[PDB]
Structures are given as C-alpha cells and as structure tokens.
Amino acid sequence: QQDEYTSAGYVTCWYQTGLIVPPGAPPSCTILCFASACNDFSVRNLRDTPFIEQTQLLQ
Amino acid sequence: QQDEYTSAGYVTCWYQTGLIVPPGAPPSCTILCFASACNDFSVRNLRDTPFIEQTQLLQ
C-alpha cells in the first residue's frame, strides 16, 4: 500500500519514428503488456487480501 | 496389376487451417505432386508393356 513516502516512479511509452504500415496491411495494431517479477523479488509480511470477502457461512 | 487382394490403401489431403493470403497476393495457388520410390524398392518379374503397340513393320 505505497504512500507518497516509499512510492515508485511513473512508467511511460512514446513514439520514436511512427509506425510505418504498407498499403496491403491494416494501419492499426495491438500491443499487450506482460508483467512478472525478476529473479530478485522478496515479500516481508503476511496479511488478509482486501479483494475477496464473505457475508455468512455459505452453504 | 493390383487386385482386391494385394491392393494398396487410399491417400488423401485435407485443409487444417485454411490458406490465409494477404490483400496484395492472388487468393488461388497451385500445388504439384512429385512421386519417386524410396531407396528400398524392388521389381520381381519382366513382361510386355501394355502401353505401346504396333500394327505392321513400320517403314
């Protein structure tokens, strides 16, 4: 839960030359992003995930 | 001269994905078949060829 302190820098992508697509191909293209930690990654504490919840004993 | 006995199996070719040809190229294409025996081929007897014939002494 990063605060202004212990935060991380912005990441951005900008055109350098401009995509050059020939007449026979569609001009638009789609780029996708894959994110995985490098080998040197570590965790330090353990806590409840604030993503899943429940209300009653589900039956 | 294969009979039902000592006959050989059928050979067939089917589309797996479908030819994908881009706008700049012609959609139709032509495939050709080359047939040659592998190294292990053998013949056993000798006989007249039933493909060529004659009528008289050609002069």
Concatenated DSSP letters of B16-57: SS-----TTS-S-----------SS---------TT---SS-
Residue at B39: amino acid letter: N
CB proximity A23 to B under 8 Å = yes
**B37 is written with which tokens?**
């025996």
> In this complex, do B22 and A23 lie within 8 Å of one another by their Cβ atoms?
no
CB A24 within 8 A of CB B22: yes
Interatomic CA distance for residues A22 and B25, integer angstroms = 14
Side-chain-side CA neighbours of B55 within 13 Å: the count stands at 1
Partners of residue A25 in chain B, C-beta under 8 Å: 22
Separation in Å, CA A32 to CA A15, A29, A35:
16, 10, 10
Separation in Å, CA A18 to CA A25, A26, A36, A54, B39:
15, 15, 28, 49, 56
Taking one residue from A and the other from B, the number of pairs with CB-CB distance under 8 angstroms is 5
Identify the experimental approach.
Answer: cryo-EM
For residue A26, the distance in angstroms to the closest alpha carbon of chain B comes to: 10
Residue at B44: amino acid letter: R
**Resolution of the structure in the document, Å:** 3.8
CA nearest to B25 within chain A: A24
Query: In terms of Cα–Cα distance, which of A5, A33, A30, A11 is closest to A19?
Result: A30
CB proximity A27 to B under 8 Å = no
Interatomic CA distance for residues B22 and B26, integer angstroms = 8
Cα torsion A2, A9, A33, A27: sign: positive
CB proximity A25 to B under 8 Å = yes
